[PDB]
Design a protein around this ligand. Structure first.
Ligand code: HEM
Ligand code: HEM
Ligand SMILES: Cc1cc(N)nc2cc(-c3ccc4c(c3)CN(C)CCO4)ccc12
Ligand SMILES: Cc1cc(N)nc2cc(-c3ccc4c(c3)CN(C)CCO4)ccc12
Ligand SMILES: Cc1cc(N)nc2cc(-c3ccc4c(c3)CN(C)CCO4)ccc12
Ligand SMILES: Cc1cc(N)nc2cc(-c3ccc4c(c3)CN(C)CCO4)ccc12
Ligand SMILES: [Zn+2]
Lengths: 416, 411
């Protein structure tokens, strides 16, 4: 590996120099002969053995004491010794509160696919490592939602449940986000509600949930403590801030009956710090408008929102070259942004977010020596080339602490 | 080993074995991916013969005559020719095969379902810039075809010692000049400001309009390049108007019909063709008229939004996005109305998915660069957005080469 790699911005001609990639610890999936940059992800018995844990913990503790300008100190050496004794005698170790907070913020700071990382150091960390039951998890999650929502002035936050021990006592949130709408596949094939959530909805109903069978039924929480079987809980509806979607010019848009929830809280990823694995760690921020997945709702039978909007706009839907899909996609995204701003719910448009990210990326190159960034996920899903990330070259690599994918729990769980 | 790629809308999984036959580096490593870097990075007798062999082998394998009589005879003939001349010459059949397969292997090209329909013009006998101009005129006339555009490539003599290169200095056969105004705005096409100044310094007398077709600057056998004017009756153009906004035509915009890329290098069996202009037809989003100045301060993007009376105070109004869609509607509407071949990004990406399926079935895979295949607008409502791809470098190939004015020893 060469010591300095350059990235160029082809609009501004600015060149940045990356050295931070020398600190990457996980494989990308690419090789010198093949690039897997567009692959989305390139057993339970296995937890870190003692001998695998030692070097990962040292690397994290070193990095932590380096960041607080205490590298090589008495404090640093005593912590190393203390961690090594814990691993020696218990096969694991416990993070200090300060290291837990540092590790969670840097897992976000290192998330190469996240365009909102300019915010990385303003993360509220909730330590739920004292949790023991699904009821306790529900309590912790309700407080998280209430704190993060903050009556529409959203605050990014993470709640960290106990780390993995032997792999048979994992804490898991089975939801993919804390707030999602149910989806119901009808006998004739059409979809009621959110088609993205049909499978998990079926699991909840299988587990005993009584579905209202509407378009916007907030799913229950499915929570697993200490490897036990997961248990169902209803989020108090007053904790779920929602926004009705309307359009600033099209009076008929509201008649589509659409709304969306304010808080994106992803809960099916894994947080890795110093070799420790926090398999339940829901984190939340606020939305970028393009993320809001209302366009895939069915309006009726075979017409989704995108098509219905085009019909109501009276666009020519016969030929594709009329760009009716593009026109309707813009109007939907205009409606989303206008509705959140009107109700004073935090949201960011893709122009502002990518513009902030470029400034963040420059600051990180200057102050940190690099900024891992996954162009394939950073560029927004519409109007790519008119955002400043499109012509920005990026280097992708995996730093630790990190957020990682993990198997869906229903595939791996051993039912009691 | 075998590698799988999933489409997350259709859940189709394809299995890639063809990447195993790749031997040029991508730029990535196990620890750093350079998928968004635009370019991450003469032949001796010893280097040449294995490359020539590999290509001859795959050629005779493709015509199902591997290990045949004529196959063995060709390897011996090529080997002897490298030994005595330090290079070798491709047969016409091989030249056509190689050119089509360089297109087939262009991982960044969404239009490759057409790869086998390519008219190849052998210009390896050319000796002078005048001859290059002749070959290029014939290429343009054939490819334009009164608006029924036909894909084509013209291939000039291969590199020898590196001091006698043939080069087309233009980036495309047809482009508009760009004039940086002391004002501060740009007259004409801002993307061509540098080459425009090189043409002026070379003696071109600029008309200083908005749509001045640049002269050809042609370099034969390493000599200094020479200027030529393409006959205007050969340059097919389309006035840009809008099917609903009658004021769009008042922006006075137009574009040329023939995209013909002339600054890339074609590599076949170890031989290097530094002058090989290739042309097809446009995808509507490629047409970079949005970056024109309408006045001394506002973009076509800004001018369109202004005439649509959009709110341009805040980005969240998405005025840029709205105007961008309307400019692309007009481009497509204008080419179709004038019966000039064009493809929209929905049809093109849809065709590319079908191309991938074909290629995985018959070839074992298809190298594809997601970063370049996804169109520059409305990405997620095209079928390629959710299509996983594998990117790898197969030869024959089209390659980047430095601008000739940074390497040329002037005399
Ligand atoms: C504060 C406002 C935030 C915004 C606007 C934002 C924006 C985004 C967007 C637009 C994506 C890609 C979405 C997609 O492709 O569908 C993303 C991905 C991601 N975000 Fe952020 N994010 C925010 C906060 C956070 C926080 C607080 C965390 C964690 C502490 C986080 C961690 C991640 C990760 C790990 C990914 C990649 C997920 C994956 O690989 O599957 N984000 N973010
Ligand atoms: C026939 C219709 C064709 C269409 C619609 C088409 C479309 C495109 C598009 C949209 C791009 C990317 C454009 C950009 O990023 O600005 C591209 C790239 C490319 N095209 Fe095609 N193309 C066509 C024909 C051809 C032909 C005939 C050749 C050569 C024989 C070719 C070779 C290439 C190459 C080499 C690239 C990548 C350039 C690079 O690596 O820098 N294309 N094509
Ligand atoms: C905190 C936060 C705020 C926000 N506005 N967007 C976010 C988007 C993601 C995200 C985006 C894509 C994605 C996944 C998560 C899940 N992985 C595991 C599957 C692949 O797809 C995560 C967190 C977000
Ligand atoms: C290559 C690539 C780049 C990028 N930026 N995002 C991607 C997102 C997905 C994705 C994954 C799961 C998913 C959906 C999208 C949404 N729909 C289709 C419902 C099913 O859930 C797949 C590939 C992506
Ligand atoms: C034949 C044909 C038809 C068509 N419709 N589009 C095309 C686009 C390209 C192309 C696209 C992008 C690009 C470059 C060329 C030049 N390289 C050297 C720098 C990187 O940028 C090439 C050929 C095309
Ligand atoms: C990462 C990436 C992906 C992609 N799909 N396309 C890209 C195109 C360029 C590009 C490079 C040079 C250039 C222009 C575009 C055109 N304008 C900006 C005039 C100046 O020349 C750079 C990066 C790209
Ligand atoms: Zn890569």
């Amino acid at each position: 590996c060469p010591r300095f790699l350059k990235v160029k911005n082809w609009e501004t001609e600015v060149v940045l120099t990356d050295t931070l990639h020398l600190k990457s610890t996980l494989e990308t999936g690419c090789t010198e002969y093949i690039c897997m940059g567009s692959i989305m992800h390139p057993r339970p018995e296995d937890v870190a053995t003692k001998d695998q844990l030692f070097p990962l913990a040292k690397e994290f503790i070193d990095q932590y004491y380096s960041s607080i300008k205490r590298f090589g100190s008495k404090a640093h050496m005593e912590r190393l010794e203390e961690v090594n004794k814990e691993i020696d005698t218990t096969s694991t170790y416990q993070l200090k509160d300060t290291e837990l907070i540092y590790g969670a913020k840097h897992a976000w700071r290192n998330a190469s696919r996240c365009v909102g990382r300019i915010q990385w150091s303003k993360l509220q960390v909730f330590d739920a490592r004292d949790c023991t039951t699904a009821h306790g998890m529900f309590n912790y999650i309700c407080n998280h939602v209430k704190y993060a929502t903050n009556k529409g002035n959203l605050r990014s936050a993470i709640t960290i449940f106990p780390q993995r021990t032997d792999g048979k006592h994992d804490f898991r949130v089975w939801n993919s986000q804390l707030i999602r709408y149910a989806g119901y596949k009808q006998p004739d094939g059409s979809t009621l509600g959110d088609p993205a959530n049909v499978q998990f909805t079926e699991i909840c109903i299988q587990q005993g949930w009584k579905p209202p069978r509407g378009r916007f039924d907030v799913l229950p929480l499915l929570l697993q403590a200490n490897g036990n079987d997961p248990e169902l809980f209803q989020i108090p509806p007053e904790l779920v801030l929602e926004v009705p979607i309307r359009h600033p010019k099209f009076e008929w848009f509201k008649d589509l009956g659409l709304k969306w929830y304010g808080l994106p809280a992803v809960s099916n990823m894994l947080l890795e710090i110093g070799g420790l694995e926090f398999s339940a760690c829901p984190f939340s921020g606020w939305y970028m408008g393009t993320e809001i997945g209302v366009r895939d709702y069915c309006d009726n039978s075979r017409y989704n929102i995108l098509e219905e909007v085009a019909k109501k706009m009276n666009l020519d839907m016969r030929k594709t070259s009329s760009l009716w899909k593009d026109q309707a996609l813009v109007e939907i995204n205009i409606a989303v942004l206008y509705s959140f701003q009107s109700d004073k719910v935090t949201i960011v448009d893709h122009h502002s977010a990518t513009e902030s990210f470029i400034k963040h990326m420059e600051n990180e190159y200057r102050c940190r020596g690099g900024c891992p960034a996954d162009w394939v996920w950073i560029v927004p899903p519409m109007s790519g080339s008119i955002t400043p990330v499109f012509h920005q070259e990026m280097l992708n690599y995996r730093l630790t602490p990190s957020f990682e994918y993990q198997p869906d729990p229903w595939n791996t769980h051993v039912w009691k």
